[model samples]
Target chain A: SSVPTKLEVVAATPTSLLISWDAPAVTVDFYLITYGETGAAGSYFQAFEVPGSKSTATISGLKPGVDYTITIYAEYYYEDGYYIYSPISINYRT
Target chain B: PGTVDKKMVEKCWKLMDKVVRLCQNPKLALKNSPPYILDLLPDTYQHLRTILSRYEGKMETLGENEYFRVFMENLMKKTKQTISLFKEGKERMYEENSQPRRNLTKLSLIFSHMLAELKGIFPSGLFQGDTFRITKADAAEFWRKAFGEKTIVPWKSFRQALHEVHPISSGLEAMALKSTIDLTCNDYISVFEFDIFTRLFQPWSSLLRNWNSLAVTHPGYMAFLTYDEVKARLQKFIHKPGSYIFRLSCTRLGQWAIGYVTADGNILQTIPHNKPLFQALIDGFREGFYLFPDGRNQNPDLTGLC
Candidate 1:
């Protein structure tokens, strides 16, 4: 289960975007941003790694005149295993 | 239960604003003048009304040259027709009354002088680039030469103000068609608010330019207030999630020229993609803010220079 989870896509622009999220656990290894355009079918695009414990960073100079899809991924570690991924996607215009 | 639709409220607010714009006194362009004249002459008011109606109707969307040519042509003809009306009216009066024609002569001269002064208030070749029959040059020069020149001789108040501004800045000197020769494109109070399609691309050139641009990131205070005042006032606008970006940028601009604590009461928060704000501030002006609260400025006179 997601730990007391919440997420948000705060701003979407043709040139850039900013996303934010929160989870009470606060002990995750990394936060990754995954994005896909509407043209992409079931397969989402690559997940870009964002640093640990950073609440925000600006992603700039994105493509113009295109529709984009986005999601936040949380990387988790288990005592008996390496790591697992939890992904949530949202639709947006940029 | 409050059943009012927020959409309706917003629509009503906008509608009322447009309505008020129509009613805003159209004569406040006189603040910087020598008081001997009725600033923003009546004829100008009528001409401005027609131009504005044309703009709101369909001219606002026209290409620059087309709009300017049509506006200028109509405006010049209106001027000539007005002068002819005054001439004929006075001649009829003199012929009919057959009285002590002294006052009649004085009245005729007064009307001509006033008309000439009013004509001076309109810009000569604002955008008449290339579409009209008469070259903008010929049309403009023709109007100026045909009228000879407006002489203020004996108006001590006007003369005094003219002289006062000169030695302190540029001295007041009159010559035949000298004012015409120097045909200035400046407005009464110089602030670049908004227009349909013109912008001052060079942002740093004027205080108003810096104050209103997103790139310059200059604050609204650039329009006319102190930086501090502009900042404090701007802080009260835009309270939505991502609105923070607009406020932050706006606050920074306010702190540039105006101080941090003062604010003009009428400043509105602008959107990131707003082009209308740039156009509205410049093209909308009238005269008469002093005597009539409804009197709109001939130009929004906040910046104090043309």
Candidate 2:
């Protein structure tokens, strides 16, 4: 499991949120970030992937004044591309 | 010495673009369109074949337009394959009409796409504006004859009849959402709907499993919401069996789900969401589908019956 650790939402605005995290102890090939409206009955969700070199991402195009859950995972780029997410994900409202 | 006209090539491309776009309009109701296109396909393909052979897959001879030359070659090859498929399907229609439902459904969509592409290859277009009109008229006239004085053909028989004439292959249509109608059960969740719960349950989950219904690489909401979420929405409505309730409950995403579900049934039943309604998604599910899991060699959950 190459899940990124120390995930945090460093900044937030009505339309976007800045996410940062620490790479997993092992070599992680890439980073995948998933964020969207988080609710049991509510269904709006999305995912984004960034290069492994960086542990930060700014997710945008969200609804105004809405709560979102963001999860970052570390994955192998060339290998199976399987992703492992960590227990320390972040949550923010924008 | 044979040469292809550049303007003619461009004209064909434009027509293909229009045809493809037209089929995309869900409101347009293309049920009348496919048969009409099939009427003219045979002769039109033969003419294109002749013109393509004249150039012999060479660009220099065809007005020195290398791009159009490659386009012509690809277009001709695709159209030829489509035509042969139609011929085979037509033959099968007469042989007790045993073309597979999934193949028929898929081929119908592909043929619509192929016809549009074919139009882009020709100058006048596959079903030029006027020709399209004639074909529609012809289809209506055909319905009148098929129904005699009945005035309207019920959808049940019509669906069966369509299965006979439609240009589909012999085998299964992979990952299709389909519901079965039998005396024992008038309403049940389709295999596609049922699979969402079980598909993720297994370790063999692949992105190619999404089919046209869902994909991860797609931008915006579609990326988040593909076949799985769509199935989840339908799972909410399976107990009721009407788009109105489904629409009211699911909203835009639910309606989006309807398009894929419609492949199984238009007058859909709202099957009971028997299991827990709480749904969860796996990380990289969409990206894996967008990047990995080839679309071919995939099968839907309940398609063994198809």
Candidate 3:
């Protein structure tokens, strides 16, 4: 039962970018973040977890100078129904 | 002895400087018809020039007699050419070379520069019969790799080897002088390279988690631009399985200095370069290795896999 936070995304080099954010009192122990190439075509449809307790992840082997959209979300809990998909965070080119 | 604090940097600079000079000096270079001296055939010019840079890390702290003996041995080896020193030409160039003072002075200067940096009370039995040869040769091998990073020493055929394979010199030399150079390259990126790369990634982690490659550190819009492996790997590992790798070779003198250090009865210290590559670096290394097999007989023992 904590307040929501905005995601932080940054591009380190021409080909690499990073995304980070803090999660509050949620029971879930892991986070699943996903993204794809932003503009004139596609991106990685798969979601990957950050290694260990580190909140940062290195998404390597991407196209040089290509734009990408990264989205990270925590598990959402509903009043009684199944589950809710929280808002997704977004970012761009490195 | 002066302050150990200041001397560390001074000695380091002296050591590095020694490496840079051996590569730049025309007389000390390993090419024929060196740039500074004129009318010398590239072969003959290359003859002396090449030997000067050939082995690095060959420093010695021998006493007066032993030092003189080693110095003379190296000089005599430099001069024993069967061909005439010069053509019967319009310009009497041989007269210029006949000055023993010129040769002795040049060598003496080099000797003093090497001697100036010796720290206090080195090992006693540093003066063995084969000490100079073994230590110098080994140090040369180490320093050559320090200035630059080389995955392979391109195999070039000696003129004699062209007639038969028995005289081959495949850069895979025998270390400490058994018939050929005894030391060999590992074909992997060096620890120094990893250190640089580690420094590179650590600072920018918050920004580039999903990074592919770094832009060339020094890039321009020049036509037909070629990059060293370090730069090239930055591009290649963009989505590859291997991590980025850096290779470092010592300046020529660095290699010789290492030899001198060892001959003075110091053990050569080598840091193991086993840091995990950025997955991307590892991927490229694996593929490149598969394509190249890391040169001839790389896994002669097949022990790396097992």
Candidate 4:
């Protein structure tokens, strides 16, 4: 898993954040966005989805004054219909 | 009282230099202008205060002559005048007209401050030029040229006129005024499709703002074919929440203008929390729809202005 080279947090609140990034220039079916606390006690599973055309998203329902690790993956579908992911992760504090 | 000294002349140059920057771009003092004057006000005033205090009683030692007192007196007066000008401009921006917001007032207020600051920076009876001499007649003509559709010079014609004036094939001259042919969109369908989707919800102001490309064309007409045309074409984009472009339009002073309908295509839902709407609009701008250089908010909330 690599990191999204062109990613940044556009805006943030105590409970939410608005994120944006440039997508891969070639082709992408959609983007998978996932986030969870950093250095927390256990395994976490939370993810949001966005279409390839979209460059921004509002991630909500999070505690204020806490740091979170966010990851975005460019998902590709093959001619035979298979999902391939190129994962890019980054850290964002909420 | 003594005579004109080195300190007095140095102070004059300092005032001249700072005020000249303002003269170059009068809009800098505008609260809405980037790098706002109000942000610089505290430090400027602090410096003013310090200067006044520095030479107050020590004037006698620092060649405290009649000319020195006179110039010092003039300097203090100009400083206060500039500060007062800022206050007046701030007040004008905050006050509400019955209309959505008069574009005239917004621009005129900035000019008024510019006039005052330019005058105040010069010694009394010095600046006798057209730079600060804006009359009501001048303003009326200026606004008429600005807002009157008839007064607008056609962009294409103006662009051609520019090219002819500076005809160049390469080097710095070509770089200065060049054709955009070298820069282009590779995919016409995707570009046109995206352009139409982003523009449909825009107000007339936005259209006029982007007049040349968006106003009329077979492709633009094609974009309005039907919802059927847009729906399938924008399948991946439709039904996506917050897909619409949002903008913080008409920011005058530090106060954000309000009550604009930012809805477009997929976003037909009513938004609650005027505060959140404002934040969302700002956030969208922060997300960089146009991305860089110009950094213009692509979807300006047109309803925010009259």
Best by TM-score: 4
**Model 1 TM-score, all chains together:** 0.22
Docking class of 4: incorrect
Per-residue alpha-carbon lDDT of model 4 for A1-94, expressed as tens digits? 3424477888989999998776443445457788889876436748756755467789889988888988888765432332655676678877
The models' CA-based lDDT, in order, is: 0.34, 0.38, 0.30, 0.39
Model 4 lDDT per residue over B165-190, tens place: 32334322222121111011111111
Off by over 4 Å in 2: A1-94, B1-36, B39-63, B86-90, B95-97, B100-108, B114-213, B216-306
True contacts kept of each: 0.00, 0.00, 0.00, 0.00
Instruction: Give TM per candidate.
Output: 0.22, 0.24, 0.21, 0.29
User: At residue B227, what lDDT does model 2 achieve?
Assistant: 34
| Residue ranges of candidate 4 with Cα displaced over 4 Å | A1-3, A40-43, B1-306
Write model 3 residue lDDT over B228-250, tens digit each, in one string. 32344334333332222233222
Worst 10 residues of 2 chain B by lDDT: B177-186
- Candidates arranged by TM-score, highest first: 4, 2, 1, 3
lDDT of 1 by residue, B131-163 (tens): 212213422233233322322112233224333
How close to the true structure is residue B282 of candidate 2, measured as C-alpha lDDT?
18
lDDT of 2 by residue, A38-70 (tens): 673325557655645465688889888887777
Docking category of candidate 2: incorrect
Flag clash pairs in model 4: B1-B65, B2-B65
- lDDT of model 1, residue B300: 27
